[PDB]
Amino acid sequence: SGFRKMAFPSGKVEGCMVQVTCGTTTLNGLWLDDVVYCPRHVICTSEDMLNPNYEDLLIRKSNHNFLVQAGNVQLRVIGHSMQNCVLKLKVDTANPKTPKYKFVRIQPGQTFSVLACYNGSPSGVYQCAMRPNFTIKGSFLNGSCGSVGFNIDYDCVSFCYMHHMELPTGVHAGTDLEGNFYGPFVDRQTAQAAGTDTTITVNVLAWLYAAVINGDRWFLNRFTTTLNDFNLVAMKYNYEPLTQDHVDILGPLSAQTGIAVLDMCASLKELLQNGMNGRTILGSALLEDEFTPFDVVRQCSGVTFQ
Amino acid sequence: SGFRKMAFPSGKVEGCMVQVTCGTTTLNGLWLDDVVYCPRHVICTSEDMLNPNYEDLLIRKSNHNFLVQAGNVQLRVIGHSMQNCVLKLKVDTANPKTPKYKFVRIQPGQTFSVLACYNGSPSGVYQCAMRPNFTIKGSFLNGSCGSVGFNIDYDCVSFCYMHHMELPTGVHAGTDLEGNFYGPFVDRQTAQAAGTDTTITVNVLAWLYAAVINGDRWFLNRFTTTLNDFNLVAMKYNYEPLTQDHVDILGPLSAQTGIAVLDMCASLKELLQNGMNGRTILGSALLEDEFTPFDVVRQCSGVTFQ
Numbered sequence A, B: 001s002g003f004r005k006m007a008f009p010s011g012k013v014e015g016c017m018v019q020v021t022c023g024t025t026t027l028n029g030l031w032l033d034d035v036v037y038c039p040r041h042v043i044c045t046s047e048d049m050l051n052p053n054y055e056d057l058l059i060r061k062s063n064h065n066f067l068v069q070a071g072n073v074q075l076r077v078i079g080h081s082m083q084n085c086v087l088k089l090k091v092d093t094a095n096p097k098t099p100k101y102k103f104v105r106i107q108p109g110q111t112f113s114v115l116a117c118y119n120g121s122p123s124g125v126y127q128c129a130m131r132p133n134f135t136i137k138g139s140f141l142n143g144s145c146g147s148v149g150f151n152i153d154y155d156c157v158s159f160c161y162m163h164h165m166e167l168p169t170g171v172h173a174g175t176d177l178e179g180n181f182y183g184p185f186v187d188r189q190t191a192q193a194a195g196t197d198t199t200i201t202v203n204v205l206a207w208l209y210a211a212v213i214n215g216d217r218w219f220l221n222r223f224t225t226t227l228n229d230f231n232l233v234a235m236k237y238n239y240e241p242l243t244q245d246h247v248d249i250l251g252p253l254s255a256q257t258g259i260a261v262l263d264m265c266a267s268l269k270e271l272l273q274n275g276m277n278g279r280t281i282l283g284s285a286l287l288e289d290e291f292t293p294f295d296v297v298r299q300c301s302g303v304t305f306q
């Protein structure tokens, strides 16, 4: 037992990370087969991030402008093209450590692992959720752009995130690996801001089920509630509405614990209206919302990845 | 910015993980050069974990009894010996992915990354601290024994933990890689229990400094306190005593923030006596104690590992 915010093993992604330098900008790239993917703002100079113009800027670039370090080994760039907000640097060597992979785009409420990198070298790994407002609460310093987020499904890496920027509240914004931003953000220096967030209701319920599985039961009650009347309380506390599909997705956790989903909702209702009264749940004094039902089932059953 | 509980990239350890099967027991082993390390209780049968006798049990074993799977490739065991509570299985192949490594033993209060494994296959990675009572609050199911904990210092893996067991409160106990248990636990089924824990004071202060660096300042005050009189409050709230060496270790974080260590202690004192009054620190409603000063400096400065 135990419940711990768990990332996927990072080895398969570590072997894809490289350093991309152009002009005075150094950031990270992702090397898969003979392409290096990286944020297009590597082409820019401090005065370019005012109102930059990437098509104009890119036509002025040459392949030799792009220095790509794979560890202590340099790669010729033999072509370059923009795809939305990422660059694709075509190189003369396919990465022999290319895992099986997919480029997927995730939904707010879904989680993934981030391999934070600097100068093409992995620094650490941690789990994040895509917030309802399309930001992530990460840990990113200068030079971390191009770090990727991912999930692993048996032997296949599903890349879902590439880091581009921090917003003024200290949250982070980026793109999918096709270069399309998550949320209404642009890779320019503007006054852009996150915008209002909500709590991921279905994930809180999943985490309450994780707590029960691990022996925290004090918040359980015999009360129940209707889906409609729970959702009236959810809206009050700036929680997302719970749908019948959410109820269905929580079925297996409901079956394992013997606690009906709507009964767990009645527990959440009481927690929202009364607080915790000095008690904790899975070592937290807050209702936690960055574990999906999948994350709970995975950890409270022990699935691996070769 | 941001502050997130971060593990080391796990790739170097993933390449060392193997499956060890003997009789009906399957667990994980660590393959370095031509030795596989694993918990000695793999040699035992359900009725052996009552009062088992590992020297007697091991002399009755044969090399061929030990099935070692390195992925989809089998390794002949060519020798075996016990070292304290671990077995060393000498195999006919050196692991070509052996990183540079050391076997170190850590102090309570120190942190490390755990690569949870099942059937020799990595499942997930997360950060743990060695509690003052020599337990760790992990996430471990059946078949996870032999998973290791580690730190990485530039290119060198310092293995510090190998998992052996869960205790009745849901915490976990194991050994260093020389097979010596952390704390007063034995690899037998007894009524053993964790025993009283305390909060790691110097780590809480480090995390308060991490909060300031990231813009949480509401808990700061102009108050100050003496080391002696802080420690009177610490004892009251079952926090560890703060030593002058702890104060020294917090120096760099004090210098970066401009908040004297003793002033931060005065802030902690107020937090302990008053609580948080509905506010949070780095997304937590509890005083967090599993980040060391090193962990804070590392993450709030961006060190990597090749």
Ligand SMILES: *[C@H](O)[C@H](C[C@@H]1CCNC1=O)NC(=O)[C@@H]1[C@H]2CCC[C@H]2CN1C(=O)COc1ccc(Cl)cc1Cl
Pocket: A027, A041, A049, A140, A141, A142, A143, A144, A145, A146, A164, A165, A166, A167, A168, A172, A186, A187, A188, A189, B001
């Ligand atoms: C890329 O390495 C960089 C990552 C940033 C730096 C600090 N934390 C991060 O996540 N990205 C940027 O510097 C981007 C840059 C590309 C697109 C727009 C440009 C501005 N930008 C920002 O992140 C701006 O915001 C910001 C916020 C807070 C701090 Cl302390 C620093 C910055 Cl640069």
Ligand SMILES: *[C@H](O)[C@H](C[C@@H]1CCNC1=O)NC(=O)[C@@H]1[C@H]2CCC[C@H]2CN1C(=O)COc1ccc(Cl)cc1Cl
Pocket: A001, B027, B041, B049, B140, B141, B142, B143, B144, B145, B146, B164, B165, B166, B167, B168, B172, B186, B187, B188, B189
């Ligand atoms: C090894 O894979 C196993 C890991 C355990 C299993 C559940 N969580 C864990 O961390 N270790 C054991 O089963 C050990 C075994 C070797 C030494 C003494 C023997 C008893 N033991 C325990 O962990 C006993 O405790 C325990 C506690 C709670 C549960 Cl749900 C299950 C167990 Cl087995």
